[PDB]
Design an enzyme around this catalytic site. Structure first.
Site, short mmCIF file in Angstrom:
data_model
loop_
_atom_site.label_atom_id
_atom_site.label_comp_id
_atom_site.label_asym_id
_atom_site.label_seq_id
_atom_site.Cartn_x
_atom_site.Cartn_y
_atom_site.Cartn_z
N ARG A 13 -2.34 -8.90 8.67
CA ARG A 13 -2.04 -8.50 7.28
C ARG A 13 -3.25 -7.79 6.73
O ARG A 13 -4.18 -8.73 6.14
CB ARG A 13 -1.11 -9.13 6.31
CG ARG A 13 -0.76 -8.58 5.30
CD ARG A 13 0.67 -7.93 5.54
NE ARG A 13 0.89 -6.49 4.48
CZ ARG A 13 1.92 -6.72 3.68
NH1 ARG A 13 2.61 -7.73 3.30
NH2 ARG A 13 1.86 -5.72 2.87
N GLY A 14 -3.42 -6.39 6.91
CA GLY A 14 -4.56 -5.98 6.47
C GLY A 14 -4.87 -5.99 4.98
O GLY A 14 -6.07 -6.44 4.59
N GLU A 15 -3.81 -5.93 4.13
CA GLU A 15 -4.40 -5.94 2.68
C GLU A 15 -4.67 -7.53 2.16
O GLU A 15 -5.32 -7.63 1.24
CB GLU A 15 -2.99 -5.62 2.01
CG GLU A 15 -1.90 -6.82 2.17
CD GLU A 15 -0.75 -6.91 0.90
OE1 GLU A 15 0.20 -7.66 0.79
OE2 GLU A 15 -0.88 -5.63 0.37
N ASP A 16 -4.37 -8.66 3.24
CA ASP A 16 -4.90 -9.77 2.88
C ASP A 16 -6.17 -10.03 3.37
O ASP A 16 -7.16 -10.82 2.78
CB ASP A 16 -3.99 -10.95 3.71
CG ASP A 16 -2.69 -11.04 3.04
OD1 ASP A 16 -2.48 -10.51 1.67
OD2 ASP A 16 -1.61 -11.64 3.49
N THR A 17 -6.65 -9.72 4.77
CA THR A 17 -7.75 -10.18 5.27
C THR A 17 -8.63 -9.11 6.31
O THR A 17 -9.61 -9.68 6.86
CB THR A 17 -7.35 -11.34 6.70
OG1 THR A 17 -6.39 -10.37 7.34
CG2 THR A 17 -6.65 -12.33 6.08
N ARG A 18 -8.30 -7.95 6.00
CA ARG A 18 -9.31 -7.15 6.63
C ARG A 18 -10.66 -7.16 6.09
O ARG A 18 -11.76 -7.31 6.71
CB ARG A 18 -8.71 -5.60 6.50
CG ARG A 18 -9.89 -4.68 6.77
CD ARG A 18 -9.50 -3.07 7.40
NE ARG A 18 -10.67 -2.53 7.36
CZ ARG A 18 -10.79 -1.17 7.12
NH1 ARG A 18 -9.80 -0.44 6.96
NH2 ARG A 18 -12.06 -0.49 7.39
N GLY A 45 3.93 3.49 9.79
CA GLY A 45 5.22 4.29 9.60
C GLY A 45 6.15 3.40 9.71
O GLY A 45 6.24 2.31 9.59
N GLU A 79 5.76 -7.12 14.71
CA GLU A 79 4.87 -7.53 15.95
C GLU A 79 4.75 -9.26 16.48
O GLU A 79 4.66 -9.23 17.55
CB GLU A 79 3.24 -7.34 15.31
CG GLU A 79 2.82 -5.92 15.31
CD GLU A 79 1.34 -6.03 14.90
OE1 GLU A 79 0.91 -6.93 14.61
OE2 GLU A 79 0.91 -4.64 14.50
#
Length: 163
Positions: A13-18, A45, A79
């Site tokens: 989850r990019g908003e968490d761990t990128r 999308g 995913e």
């Protein structure tokens, strides 16, 4: 054997761990020669890109960076469903799955199995199964530590299990 194009499909989850855990993990895997497809390079999308699904099928394994909001994203859960289908179905070689619990307790991720109501009805059964199976695999339950060294330990362990 079936055709493998990556050692690792990296789901997160990019908003968490990128910033910066998963960015640093991606780089660290590559520096160890662990060929990695990260899941966030395609335009998002309403529907998951078919090219993402094909990358999962073509990878030897998936690394799941569980975090607070991973199980609160339809995208991430879709995913995960594909990853766990490959883990159950693929053969010679299998599709291994390695979960990282990033500053979230495994018990907390498990509790999200029953919380798909407050997070958001035909998809929830399959989401729940995949999340349950993935949260129960052996992985790395990280607390607030020295992140560069945590990544070193994780990538060395993936290296030993894959390469």
């Amino acid at each position: 054997a079936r055709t493998i194009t990556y050692d690792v499909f990296l789901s997160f989850r990019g908003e968490d761990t990128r910033f910066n855990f998963t960015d640093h993990l991606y780089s660290a895997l590559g520096r160890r020669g662990i060929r990695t497809f990260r899941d966030d390079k395609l335009r998002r999308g309403e529907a998951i890109a078919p090219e993402l699904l094909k990358a999962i099928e073509e990878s030897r394994s998936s690394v799941i960076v569980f975090s607070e909001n991973y199980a609160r994203s339809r995208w991430c859960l879709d995913e995960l469903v594909k990853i766990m289908e490959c883990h159950k179905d693929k053969k010679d070689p299998g599709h291994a799955v390695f979960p990282i619990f990033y500053h979230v307790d495994p018990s907390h991720v498990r509790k999200q199995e029953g919380s798909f109501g407050e997070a958001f009805k035909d998809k929830i059964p399959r989401w729940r199964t995949a999340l349950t199976e993935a949260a129960n695999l052996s992985g790395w339950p990280l607390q607030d530590g020295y992140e560069s060294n945590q990544i070193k330990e994780i990538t060395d362990s993936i290296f030993r299990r894959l390469k």
